[PDB]
Fold this sequence. Notes:
Elements: H1 13-16
The structure holds cadmium ion (CD) (4 copies).
Amino acid sequence: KSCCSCCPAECEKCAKDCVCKGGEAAEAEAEKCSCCQ
Ligand SMILES: [Cd+2]
Ligand SMILES: [Cd+2]
Ligand SMILES: [Cd+2]
Ligand SMILES: [Cd+2]
């Protein structure tokens, strides 16, 4: 069970809280996040 579609279900950054409240892309479908890279 995860809390997003850009990180695994064992991410450390997303352990305390989903820190993926970013992404300024309307026509750039990415398969990863910077905050957690
Ligand atoms: Cd994520
Ligand atoms: Cd993460
Ligand atoms: Cd998350
Ligand atoms: Cd992230």
